[PDB]
Amino acid sequence: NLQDARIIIAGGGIGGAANALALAQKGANVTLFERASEFGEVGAGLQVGPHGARILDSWGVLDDVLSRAFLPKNIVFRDAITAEVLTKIDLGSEFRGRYGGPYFVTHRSDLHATLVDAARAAGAELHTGVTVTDVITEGDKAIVSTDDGRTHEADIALGMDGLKSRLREKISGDEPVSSGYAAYRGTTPYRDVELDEDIEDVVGYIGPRCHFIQYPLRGGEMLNQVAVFESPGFKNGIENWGGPEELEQAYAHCHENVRRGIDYLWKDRWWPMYDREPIENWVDGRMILLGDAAHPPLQYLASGAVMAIEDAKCLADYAAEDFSTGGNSAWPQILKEVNTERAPRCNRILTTGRMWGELWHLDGTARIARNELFRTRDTSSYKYTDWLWGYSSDR
Amino acid sequence: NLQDARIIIAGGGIGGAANALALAQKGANVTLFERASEFGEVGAGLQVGPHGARILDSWGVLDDVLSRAFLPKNIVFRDAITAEVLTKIDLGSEFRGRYGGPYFVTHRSDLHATLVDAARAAGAELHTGVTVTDVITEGDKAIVSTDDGRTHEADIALGMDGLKSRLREKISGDEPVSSGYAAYRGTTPYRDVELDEDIEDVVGYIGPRCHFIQYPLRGGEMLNQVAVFESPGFKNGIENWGGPEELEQAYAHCHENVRRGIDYLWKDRWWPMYDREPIENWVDGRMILLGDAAHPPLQYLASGAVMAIEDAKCLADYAAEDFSTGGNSAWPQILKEVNTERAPRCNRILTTGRMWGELWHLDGTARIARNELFRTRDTSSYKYTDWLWGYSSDR
Ligand SMILES: Cc1cc2nc3c(=O)[nH]c(=O)nc-3n(C[C@H](O)[C@H](O)[C@H](O)COP(=O)(O)OP(=O)(O)OC[C@H]3O[C@@H](n4cnc5c(N)ncnc54)[C@H](O)[C@@H]3O)c2cc1C
Ligand SMILES: Cc1cc2nc3c(=O)[nH]c(=O)nc-3n(C[C@H](O)[C@H](O)[C@H](O)COP(=O)(O)OP(=O)(O)OC[C@H]3O[C@@H](n4cnc5c(N)ncnc54)[C@H](O)[C@@H]3O)c2cc1C
Ligand SMILES: [Cl-]
Ligand SMILES: [Cl-]
């Protein structure tokens, strides 16, 4: 266990919160700083596959999370132009038995609040309204500086400050890479959505230069909707690219079921999709980057938060194993071994994520080949997903 | 039978020759004009699937054709970059039993000379060095005019003057549509080709913006090679586009096995690939367009000559059925019914041919989807080919 260990965490997103929980359950002294004045996430959906669900269960928060979540029966891919079913992934008992947990969807906000509360209950000291301005290593401590003039000593620091991380600059000067696709969200009361059929699945309509995703939340009361389209604005160098004026032209070619959905999206806010080129080294002395700071993906595999949750389990588990026997001295070896386990796993998600996305968005004859590939696959095979959903950091 | 029928044929390619044979065996009086001073075809390979082979057998020339032909065991598709096998079509006894004949390859010249000789032996009067300058219909005859000042009377005329048909202009003012791909050919003595493995198959290497095809001829003594690549020259408006100066850059990205092959191609002559938009009506009075005059395809399905051979059987069969009972009067009804049978069949080849070609030439993620589609298909299924190889005009 981690009794005498002091850890500081810069950033209190899903990733920071999950690390505070995982370390604090091991007996670590955890201090986390979050810039915004409250802990909060977007009131829209996210997907958490069994690779996350397992981990949440091992912290004892899955039952609670599930009580406010939705359990879809399948992931259903449809053609965005014809609305025809291309294939299904069955999320039933075979699926759960193979991967050790359910595939679920919930409100990001509720998942987030659940992790913050349990991290608090486990002993983490969380601070809102505090910006980390610098981290350096000196001797065998991490020295962390905040925007209220104070400095702080810890055994290690976690840089969990997101896609636009400033702590990343200690390790790499790369910048976010635009995909040229923008995401819009919406949650609707379920009844109030004009639906031809009912939805108890995660449904992905995939089309030339767009996609459209739908799933129920909170026991089938609301329906989460997500639209992702290639921005003509981005190619012409617009700075605030992907605005709602592009929406109607982007989906004009698509099936009515897809076009109906555009109306329910929040138009006052959207998410341009950037990621970063994969990097191998995430450690600077006694600082490690985790979460989106280390490995921000495009969202086609629905796995970025999950990756940050894995980061949390791997770090907590590996430190608990080596700290008991090696003390504060052992911290850099711990970080290196976390880095080594986590880098290939996460970097394959970033790279494969890009290829998966391109596969969704193909046109012409390429679309016809892709449709046929999907329809005719062996649905009892798990070769396309074991690497994703069947990973574990356990050694 | 066709005893009292007089038919004139403008053009003595594979298609004209095959029609002279088919009509003359029914007892028709056949006159064919060929522009060039000799009957002759390119001394390079072509492929004749069972949809052609059957028909050649029913004229009694298949045994003879096969005695100088090659019988491949499979059609093997490989990736042009890795040289990996993607899939095979088995050409064995199941294949032959289902489709009623062999898939074979031979020299175009030898197939051509075989059809000319049998058409002669069957009573067709063939004339070289004679250009048809016009065909009109007047009353119940076709009036055909030649470049030696003469005119000629017949019950019907066949416009079989090729891709660049001038007789087509009576029915349509459309022009050939460039694909932007050029084909090069080569026949090598088999031994003299540097081969890693031996080849007893039709092999197609398919790659981004190119392909490369190889098969043995004449009992495995020579190896036919064909290179097809997208011409940068064509996009920039070059008039004589697709020259051999493009070859090395076109295949630079491809596997060594593909690059080795470029060296054996004839460089003094190449074939820019044009086709035409499909048309429904091929008949002007007592003239019918057939062969490439009516339906010129891109060569990805290896079926243009075959289509002209089918044209021959269908016309001969349908006329033999209706002429015996209805005489010269019946000729326009005969042409219409030939047209109606043949148009959808051939026009699906032109359109699907284009899509098939695009499928060969895909790049990036589209290439990865296509490769995987090919590898994982059900090889006992015949759904991708029945429509092609299992067609018959018989009613
Ligand atoms: C449209 C969309 C859909 C998605 N869907 C899914 C999905 O379905 N499933 C899934 O698993 N993932 C999904 N993701 C990815 C997922 O949202 C992210 O990977 C994940 O939230 C990253 O969490 P994080 O804690 O590492 O970073 P963030 O959530 O960005 O949190 C960083 C935090 O640090 C704070 N901060 C920044 N700088 C400082 C500083 N100097 N000091 C203190 N605090 C600071 C920020 O305020 C923020 O709270 C999606 C992403 C998008 C864009
Ligand atoms: C690279 C390549 C590979 C191919 N491979 C294959 C294959 O493997 N299998 C296959 O089945 N098909 C193949 N084809 C297609 C095939 O070659 C043609 O579809 C077929 O030859 C057309 O025959 P045709 O008799 O209709 O026209 P053509 O062969 O063009 O013959 C027309 C004839 O009429 C003559 N002529 C022109 N004008 C006049 C006039 N006014 N009067 C008299 N005569 C005239 C010409 O001299 C010529 O001899 C391929 C084509 C190419 C370009
Ligand atoms: Cl994601
Ligand atoms: Cl052809």
Numbering used by the authors:
A (entry chain A), B (entry chain A): 3 to 397
Question: Can I see the authors' text?
Answer:
3HB6H (EC 1.13.14.26) is a NADH and FAD-dependent monooxygenase that catalyzes the para-hydroxylation of 3-hydroxybenzoate to 2,5-dihydroxybenzoate, using a Tyr-His pair for substrate binding and catalysis. The crystal structure analysis revealed that 3HB6H has the conserved fold of group A flavoprotein hydroxylases, but differs from the other family members in additional binding of phospholipids. The fatty acyl chains of the phospholipid ligands of 3HB6H protrude into the substrate-binding pockets, whereas the surface-exposed hydrophilic headgroups are involved in enzyme dimerization. As a main result, it appears that the 3HB6H family uses phospholipids as a common tool to increase their dimerization strength.
